[PDB]
Amino acid sequence: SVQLSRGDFHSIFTNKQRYDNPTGGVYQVYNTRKSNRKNLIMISDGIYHMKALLRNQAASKFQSMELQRGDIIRVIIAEPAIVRERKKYVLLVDDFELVQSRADMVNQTSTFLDNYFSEHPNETL
């Protein structure tokens, strides 16, 4: 249907050029939660899923678009974060655009990014 940025979450946290400008990726919403906890979502690059915290315009758009699992987005403004004392990975997303609503799930059984880096402690930035 639409092509996701396969494996890009791995790139963001292993390549410093990508870490420093983690934008333009096309990802699929993997899960959402039913007050600021609403803005934490799960996204999928087709291979990995990871947590994303929507802020600012992205949090506004989450409300105005009724963003849900299956939606495909393109991240426009973002920065990575690693909570190193909990080994948690997050993409802080300040703006995105909607690519396709309610697309068929690309990979229903992806690898949680944080689990992959728990087994790859030397590759992670």
Binding site: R37, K51, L53, R55, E79, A81, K88
Partner: peptide, 15 residues
């Protein structure tokens, strides 16, 4: 939709 990621929200969010 629970409290397991309160860490992410507390530490992050603010830039």
């Amino acid at each position: 939709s629970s409290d397991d990621d309160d860490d992410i929200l507390l530490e992050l969010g603010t830039r």
